[PDB]
Design an enzyme around this catalytic site. Structure first.
Site, PDB file in Angstrom:
ATOM      1  N   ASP A 139      64.288   4.831  28.962  1.00 33.45           N
ATOM      2  CA  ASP A 139      63.985   5.946  29.880  1.00 33.45           C
ATOM      3  C   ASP A 139      62.869   6.792  29.269  1.00 33.45           C
ATOM      4  OD1 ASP A 139      64.018   7.947  31.753  1.00 33.45           O
ATOM      5  OD2 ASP A 139      65.983   8.786  31.136  1.00 33.45           O
ATOM      6  N   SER A 187      47.028  11.772  38.053  1.00 27.72           N
ATOM      7  CA  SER A 187      46.393  10.712  38.836  1.00 27.72           C
ATOM      8  C   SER A 187      45.201  11.302  39.577  1.00 27.72           C
ATOM      9  CB  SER A 187      47.418  10.101  39.789  1.00 27.72           C
ATOM     10  OG  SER A 187      46.812   9.216  40.688  1.00 27.72           O
TER      11      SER A 187
END
Ligand SMILES: OC[C@@H]1CNC[C@H]1c1ccsc1
Ligand SMILES: OC[C@H]1CNC[C@@H]1c1ccsc1
Length: 330
Positions: free
Chosen positions: A35, A199
Site C-alpha cells: 500500500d 498530473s
C-alpha cells in the site's frame, strides 16, 4: 541488495493485490497488500480477536526466534474506505522477494474491522508511503522501504501491477525489460506523507487532451481512480446510460457498454488506461448495472491514482534525497 516479488490480484476484478512476505525465524509467509498510501506493516496474528479471523494466515510471534516485543508500542489506523485495525508491535526479520530487513516493526493486530475479517485473501498490509504517516506510538516506526533503502543498489522500488494478471514489485533496481519507451519522472511533495504529484491533464477516449493540473497520490492500496467531479463527469458522459447513483455510491453504467479509454498526463508524456480496466462488473450478482472504475474524489479531499491508473503503467517510486515518481507505458 535487491528484491523482486510477484503480486497477484485477490479476485477476478483486481480489487486488490497480494504479495508474499516472509516474517520471522523460521519464516512465516503472509500475503500482504502493498500500500503506497499508508506507512504501517500490520498483520493478522495469534493476538487477533478470534471472532475477527476468518481464513487469514496469522503471524505467531511466539514461534519466531527473532521476534522481540517493542515494549509499550501500540498502533491504530483508519483507512479512506472506513476500515480499521489496531494492536501492539514486535520487531522481527522481514523479507520480500529475497530482500531482508532485520528489526522491522511488525504491527500485530488485536482488532480488525469487519471488511478485513470478511476478506480471507489479505493477511495484512505493508505500507510504502513515507514513514511520517506511521501510526506507532509513542515511537514512530519506519516502513520496510525506509529500513531497506541504505542497503539497496538504488533507493527505489517499482510497481508493475497486472490487469487481471500477476505483476511485480521490485526493490533496489529498475527492470529496463518491464516497460516500453522511456520513464517520465515528475516531482513529488512529501508534505502530506504520500507519493503526491501533479498530473498535467487528461483525455477521454480519442478526445482532445485537456491541459489541467491534477494534484493526487500514487496509491497501490486503493482499487479505483478518484478524480475531480468535472473530469469524472466528462468521462461518464461518453458512456450511454451511465449515471451517478447515490444508492450504489458512485457512477454505474450498463454492463452492455463498451467503455472508452482514459488518458492521464505525466509531464509531456501520456498513460492510456484501456476502457476494460474501468469495468468493475455487476453492482450485485446478476445485475446489468456495472460499477465504474473512475469515481469522484469530491468529499475525499484528495485525488487518488489507484490501481486502475497505476496498472496501466510501470511506476518508479524514487526514494532519493529528493523523491520523485516515474511513469512508463508497458
Ligand atoms: O483506503 C485505503 C487507502 C489506501 N491507501 C491509504 C488509504 C488512503 C488514501 C487516501 S487517504 C487514505
Ligand atoms: O476493507 C478492508 C479490506 C478488505 N478488502 C480490501 C480492504 C482494504 C482496505 C485498505 S487496503 C485493503
Amino acid at each position: 541488495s535487491t528484491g523482486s516479488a510477484t503480486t497477484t490480484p485477490i479476485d477476478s476484478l483486481d480489487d486488490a493485490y497480494i504479495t508474499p512476505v516472509q516474517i520471522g525465524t523460521p519464516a512465516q509467509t503472509l500475503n500482504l497488500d502493498f500500500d503506497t498510501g499508508s506507512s504501517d506493516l500490520w498483520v493478522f496474528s495469534s493476538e487477533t480477536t478470534a471472532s475477527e479471523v476468518d481464513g487469514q494466515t496469522i503471524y505467531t510471534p511466539s514461534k519466531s526466534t527473532t521476534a522481540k516485543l517493542l515494549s509499550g508500542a501500540t498502533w491504530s489506523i483508519s483507512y479512506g474506505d472506513g476500515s480499521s485495525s489496531s494492536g501492539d508491535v514486535y520487531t522481527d526479520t522481514v523479507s520480500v522477494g529475497g530482500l531482508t530487513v532485520t528489526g522491522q516493526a511488525v504491527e500485530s493486530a488485536k482488532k480488525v474491522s469487519s471488511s478485513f475479517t470478511e476478506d480471507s485473501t489479505i493477511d495484512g498490509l505493508l505500507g510504502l508511503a513515507f514513514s511520517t504517516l506511521n501510526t506507532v506510538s509513542p515511537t514512530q516506526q519506519k516502513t520496510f522501504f525506509d529500513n531497506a533503502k541504505a542497503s539497496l543498489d538504488s533507493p527505489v522500488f517499482t510497481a508493475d501491477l497486472g490487469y487481471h494478471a500477476p505483476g511485480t514489485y521490485n526493490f533496489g533496481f529498475i527492470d529496463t525489460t518491464a516497460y516500453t519507451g522511456s520513464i517520465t519522472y515528475t516531482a513529488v511533495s512529501t508534505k502530506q506523507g504520500f507519493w503526491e504529484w501533479t498530473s498535467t491533464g487528461y483525455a477521454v477516449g480519442s478526445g482532445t487532451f485537456k491541459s489541467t493540473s491534477i494534484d493526487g497520490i500514487a496509491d497501490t492500496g486503493t482499487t479505483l481512480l478518484y478524480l475531480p467531479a468535472t473530469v469524472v463527469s466528462a468521462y461518464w458522459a461518453q458512456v450511454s446510460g451511465a449515471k451517478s447513483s447515490s444508492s450504489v455510491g458512485g457512477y454505474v453504467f450498463p454492463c452492455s457498454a463498451t467503455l472508452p479509454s482514459f488518458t492521464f498526463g505525466v509531464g509531456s508524456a501520456r498513460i492510456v488506461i484501456p476502457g476494460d480496466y474501468i469495468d468493475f462488473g455487476p453492482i450485485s450478482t446478476g445485475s446489468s448495472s456495472c460499477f465504474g472504475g473512475i469515481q469522484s474524489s469530491a468529499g475525499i479531499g484528495i485525488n487518488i491514482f489507484g490501481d486502475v491508473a497505476l496498472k496501466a503503467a510501470f511506476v518508479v517510486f524514487n526514494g532519493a534525497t529528493t523523491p520523485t515518481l516515474g511513469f512508463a507505458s508497458k
